[PDB]
Automatic annotation (TrEMBL), chain A:
The keyword Flavoprotein does not apply. One of its GO terms (biological process) is translation. The keyword Mitochondrion does not apply. The gene is LOC101253152. Mg(2+) binds at residue 39. The lineage of its organism: Eukaryota, Viridiplantae, Streptophyta, Embryophyta, Tracheophyta. Keywords: Metal-binding, Ribonucleoprotein, Ribosomal protein. One of its GO terms (cellular component) is cytosolic large ribosomal subunit. This is 60S ribosomal protein L32. GO terms for molecular function: structural constituent of ribosome. Belongs to the eukaryotic ribosomal protein eL32 family. It comes from Solanum lycopersicum (Tomato).
From TrEMBL, chain B:
One of its GO terms (molecular function) is structural constituent of ribosome. Keywords: Ribonucleoprotein, Ribosomal protein. Transmembrane segments: none annotated. This is Ribosomal eL28/Mak16 domain-containing protein. GO terms for biological process: translation. GO terms for cellular component: cytosolic large ribosomal subunit. Belongs to the eukaryotic ribosomal protein eL28 family. It comes from Solanum lycopersicum (Tomato). Residues 7-127 form the Ribosomal eL28/Mak16 domain. It comes from the Eukaryota.
From TrEMBL, chain D:
It comes from the Eukaryota. It comes from Solanum lycopersicum (Tomato). This is Large ribosomal subunit protein uL15/eL18 domain-containing protein. Belongs to the eukaryotic ribosomal protein eL18 family.
UniProtKB/TrEMBL annotation, chain E:
Signal peptide: none annotated. Residues 5-76 form the Large ribosomal subunit protein uL30 N-terminal eukaryotes domain. The gene is LOC102594660. It comes from Solanum tuberosum. One of its GO terms (cellular component) is cytosolic large ribosomal subunit. SUPFAM superfamilies: Ribosomal protein L30p/L7e. Residues 81-131 form the Large ribosomal subunit protein uL30-like ferredoxin-like fold domain. Belongs to the universal ribosomal protein uL30 family. Keywords: Ribonucleoprotein, Ribosomal protein. GO terms for biological process: maturation of LSU-rRNA from tricistronic rRNA transcript (SSU-rRNA, 5.8S rRNA, LSU-rRNA). It comes from the Eukaryota. This is Thaliana 60S ribosomal protein L7.
Amino acid sequence: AVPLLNKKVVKKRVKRFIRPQSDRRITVKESWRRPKGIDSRVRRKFKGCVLMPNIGYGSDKKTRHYLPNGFKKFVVHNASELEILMMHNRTYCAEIAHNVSTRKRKEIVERAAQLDVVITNKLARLH
Amino acid sequence: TTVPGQLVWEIVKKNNSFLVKEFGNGTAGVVFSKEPNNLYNLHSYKHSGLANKKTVTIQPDGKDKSVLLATSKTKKQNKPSRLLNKSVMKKEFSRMAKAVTNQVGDNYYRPDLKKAALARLSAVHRSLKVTKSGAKKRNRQA
Amino acid sequence: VVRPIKRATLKKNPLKNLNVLLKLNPYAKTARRMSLLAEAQRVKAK
Amino acid sequence: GIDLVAGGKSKKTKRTAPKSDDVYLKLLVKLYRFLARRTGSKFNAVILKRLFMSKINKPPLS
Amino acid sequence: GGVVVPESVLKKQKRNEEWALVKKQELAVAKKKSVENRKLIYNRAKQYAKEYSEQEKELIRLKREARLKGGFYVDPEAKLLFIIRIRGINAMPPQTKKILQLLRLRQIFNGVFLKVNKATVNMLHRVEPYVTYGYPNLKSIKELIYKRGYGKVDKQRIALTDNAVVEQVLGKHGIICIEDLVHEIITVGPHFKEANNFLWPFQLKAPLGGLKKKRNHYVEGGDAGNRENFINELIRRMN
Amino acid sequence: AKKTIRNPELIRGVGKFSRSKMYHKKGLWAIKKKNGGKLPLHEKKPVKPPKFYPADDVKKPLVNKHKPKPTKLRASITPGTVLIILAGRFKGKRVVFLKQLTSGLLLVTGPFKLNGVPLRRVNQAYVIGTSTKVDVSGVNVEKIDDKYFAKQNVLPQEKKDEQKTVDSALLKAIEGIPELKAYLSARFSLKSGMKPHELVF
RNA sequence: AAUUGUCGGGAGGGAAGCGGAUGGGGGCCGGCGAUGCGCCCCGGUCGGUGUGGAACGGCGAGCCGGUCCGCCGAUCG
RNA sequence: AUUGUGGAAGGCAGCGCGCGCCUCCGGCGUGCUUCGGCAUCUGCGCGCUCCGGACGCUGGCCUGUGGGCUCCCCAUUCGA
RNA sequence: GAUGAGUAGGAGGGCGCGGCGGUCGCUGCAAAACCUUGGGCGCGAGCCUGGGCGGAGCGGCCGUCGGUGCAGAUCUUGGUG
Ligand SMILES: [K+]
Ligand SMILES: [K+]
Ligand SMILES: [K+]
Ligand SMILES: [K+]
Ligand SMILES: [K+]
Ligand SMILES: [K+]
Ligand SMILES: [Mg+2]
Ligand SMILES: [Mg+2]
Ligand SMILES: [Mg+2]
Ligand SMILES: [Mg+2]
Ligand SMILES: [Mg+2]
Ligand SMILES: [Mg+2]
Ligand SMILES: [Mg+2]
Ligand SMILES: [Mg+2]
Ligand SMILES: [Mg+2]
Ligand SMILES: [Mg+2]
Ligand SMILES: [Mg+2]
Ligand SMILES: [Mg+2]
Ligand SMILES: [Mg+2]
Ligand SMILES: [Mg+2]
Ligand SMILES: [Mg+2]
Ligand SMILES: [Mg+2]
Ligand SMILES: [Mg+2]
Ligand SMILES: [Mg+2]
Ligand SMILES: [Mg+2]
Ligand SMILES: [Mg+2]
Ligand SMILES: [Mg+2]
Ligand SMILES: [Mg+2]
Ligand SMILES: [Mg+2]
C-alpha cells in the first residue's frame, strides 16, 4: 500500500511536558499537571523553568495523528473489523489489539495481506 | 426505511449497532460504519446503508471469485427478506465494471455512488485474486 | 426562487514586479519607456 | 501589542442552533438554513433565527 | 432505445444551461467593460502625472517671480499629514489613548494619513510625544499604497492586488484604480474621507537604521512631533 | 515576411515603441484597406477502459507558469580560459576551458598530457576563472556533447585516441606561451598569508 | 513503591536536580527504504453477436435493463 | 541570506508573430501634437512573459562501520 | 479577514475511575494486575502497541448513574530511610 499523505510531518515539539518537580519527589508523577500555586515560577513562566503545554504547540491538522509510516492507526480485534479498512488501505493502517490470541492473529495477518492492509504489529507473539 | 431517509439519519447518526468509534471524541476520534450496504464503510448520510432507500452492496459471494452486486428494491422497504436484488457475477472485471455502471449510474439509481461502487468492485475483485494465488507484490512502490 | 448556485492571491510588490505594476497602473509602462528613452538621449548627447 | 479589547473579538453570545435535540426541529432548521442562504429572503432569515430560540422566547399565541 | 431520462434530470439540465448562458454573458459584458476601463485609467494616470509635474514647476516659477520683484512667496500650507506611532501601548493616559484610537494608531509604527484642519491639528497636538508626523511627498504616498496598501472591505483587510478591490468600495465616488486613490490622497480631494478611511492603517516595519531618541521632540534631536518634509526620509527606512 | 523584430526591448518586457507607433509598423491600416475597411476575423483552432478504479480521487498539481532557463555562463569564463578546479579528485589543478555543454556544465581539458586531466565536465560553481587565455581556435570539439560522458573498469581505446586528437591541437598553442606548460602542470594552492579575497586571478 | 545488597556502564576541585541546544557513547527501529509499471510475442489457462430459457430489477398497462444457464455466429479479449 | 504554504483554474495583465507591402538596427496610411511624440485608429487567430504560492537536473545510499530516533548515560555553552 | 498576558472568579469542550440499561467484541493458542534503556499518537488530561511476569477473567461504543481523579491538611493507617 502506498500512503496517500504527501505533506511532511512537522513536529513543533518532540520532548514531553514533564510535571514540575516530578524529578525531586517520587510521589509526584510525571503526567502533566498545571501548577496552581500563587508563587509558582513555572506558572509565571520565568525563563529557565519547565515549559507548560499550550494550544500554540498544536500540530498541523493535515498531518495530525499520522504515524511515521504515513498512515493513521485503527485498532482491530478480529478479522471482521479488519475488513472495515478495505476501502481506506491508503489512509488507515491496522494494529491488532494487545490481547488478541496468537491463533487469531494469524487469521488477521493473512486476511490483511489479501486486502493489502498495513499491519503495524504483524510480528507480535508468533515465535 | 419505511420512513424518510433523512429522518432515519437523524436517529441513527449518534448511535447504532454498526457504528465503530475509536480514540474517544477528541481530535483522535475515528469513526467507521460496518453495515454490508455501505460501500466505503463511512459514517455519513451519503454512504449510510440505513438511511437510504437506494443502496449498493458489493462483496464476495460464496466461492469461485464470484462477486455479489445487490441493490435495495424501492418498493420492498418493509420486506427485509426480499429487499435485496442480488446479482452474482463471475466474469471478467471489465464485464463486471459495466454491470455496476449499468445498475448504479445508467438507470439513475445512485449516480453519486458510481465512483465508490467501481472502487468497491475493484477492491473486492483484487482481494479475490490474491486469495486464490496469494500475495506476490508488496504494492509499496510509488 | 433559488438564486443561481455559486483563494487568497499572493500579494506581490509592484515596485519590483513589472507585470504586477502594469496590472494596477497601465500607464506605468509609458512612463518607464519615456524615462529610459530620455536618459539614453542625454547619455548620447554628452 | 495591539490596543484592542479582548483581542478584537466579540463578547456577545447568540444562538447559532437550537438547543433542543428534537429530530423534527433539526430537519426544519436544515430546510430553512438552505432557504435563507439560497434566496436571501428576509422572511426566511427571521424564521431561521426564531427556530433556535428557547421555549420562553417562543410564547404561545391565543 | 436507451434508458429514458427521468423528468427530474431533464429539469435540472435545462436550468443549468440557462444559468450557464447568463453566466457566460457576464464575461462578455464584463470583458468589454474592463477593456474600456483600462483606457480610462490609462488616461487618468497620464493626466495625473502631468498635473504633478506642473505643480512642481509652478511652485518653482512663483518663488523665482517673487525673488525678481524683491518680495516673498508664502507656500501654501500642507494639506496632508502622515502620522506614525513611535511609542508602545504601555502606561497610556486615558486622553492620549482615546485620541490615538480615533486616529487608528493602535500599534507602534502603524501609520495613517490625516487631513489638515484646526480640529485635527489640535487633536494631534495632544499626542505629540507618542507620534511623529510630517508632509509626505508623492513618492512616499505611492510606495505606501503600492507596497503596504490594504483596503477595508466589509470590515476586512484586503490587499490591493487588483483595481477591482478599489472599485468595489470607492467605485461610487469615482475612484476605480489605485492611481485614482493616490490622486485623491495627495490632493485631498472631495472624497478624501472615504478614500482615506478605506485604507487600512499601514503596518510599517521598525526603521532601518533605528531612531535617535523617541523620548525627545524632533526639535531637541529626538524623534517625536512634527518633522515636516523630513517624514519622507523616515518613510523610506520604515516602508 | 518581416526579417527583423519590429519592437526592440529597452529593458526586459518593455518595448521601444508605443502602441500607436506599433499600429503603423504592424501595418494594420494597410490590412484594413485590403479587407474592405475591416480587420479580418479568424476562427478558433478546431479511452481504454480502466483495469482498476482508485478509491481515493487522484489530485493533480496546479499549473506552474515558470519555465527553467538555460544555465548562464560566468563573464570571467571564455573559450580558452584557464580554470582552477576547487573540488573533487582534481582539486587545485589548472585546466583549459573549451566550451559549455547544453546541460550548462563546462567542458575542460588538462590537457591530459601535461597534468593528467582528460576531457571532463566540471560544474561552474566549483571552478575559478583566471585571466590567462590560451588559443583554442584549432581545437575541434563539435563531436563532444553531454552524451559523450554518459554511463552505460577499462577505458575504451576509442576515448584515449579522441583525447589525443583534441590534445595535440592544444599543445602547440600552449608551447607558444613561455612557461605556460609548467603553469598548467602545477596545482594552485594557498600558502601562509595568502588571502583568497585579495588574490587576482 | 519507599528502602537495601550485588554485578555491569558512567560521573565527581565546598550540593544535586531542572529548562533549552548540540555532541560523544549506548540502546532501539526493516511500514528503518523501493524494485514496480507500460508496451510487444511464445506458450498455457479462462471467458466471448444474434436467438432460446431461469430467477429478478429501474421507471411508472407499458417502456427500459442487468445477472445466470444453454445454442449459433463471431473469432477477439 | 531565509523560505515554496496551495494542488480546482492556462484566468487577469502586458506584449510578440501572422491576417497588407518595402531596400528590414528601419521605411510606407488617417486623427492629435509641446514636433520629442500619443491607449487616435490598437480587431481576430496562434504564442510569449517579472503574469491567480517551486519546478527541474545530477549524484550518494538502500541489510552496511548505513540511516533515523521523541529512548538511555554523560560532557560542554546559555538559562535556572 | 482579524487576533492570542492573566491571580480571585465564571463558562465551554475533552481525559480518566466504578456500576446500571443496551450494543460490539476479546480470553488457558493466556484475561486482569504488575515490570520494562522496546516503539508510536495527542498542545495536554491520556491513549495505542512490542517484550516480560502472571494464571482467570476483561474491554470498546451509546445512554445513564456515583462514596469518581491528591504532593501538602504538625492529614489517617501501614511500611521504610
Ligand atoms: K531563493
Ligand atoms: K539508505
Ligand atoms: K547542560
Ligand atoms: K459492555
Ligand atoms: K508498555
Ligand atoms: K459509563
Ligand atoms: Mg509528543
Ligand atoms: Mg504573587
Ligand atoms: Mg502484553
Ligand atoms: Mg500579537
Ligand atoms: Mg483578556
Ligand atoms: Mg514606560
Ligand atoms: Mg500590525
Ligand atoms: Mg544592519
Ligand atoms: Mg537608542
Ligand atoms: Mg517617560
Ligand atoms: Mg525499588
Ligand atoms: Mg506545495
Ligand atoms: Mg489568554
Ligand atoms: Mg472502566
Ligand atoms: Mg527504570
Ligand atoms: Mg477506556
Ligand atoms: Mg459505590
Ligand atoms: Mg471521595
Ligand atoms: Mg500521598
Ligand atoms: Mg494542593
Ligand atoms: Mg506528616
Ligand atoms: Mg506514621
Ligand atoms: Mg529510623
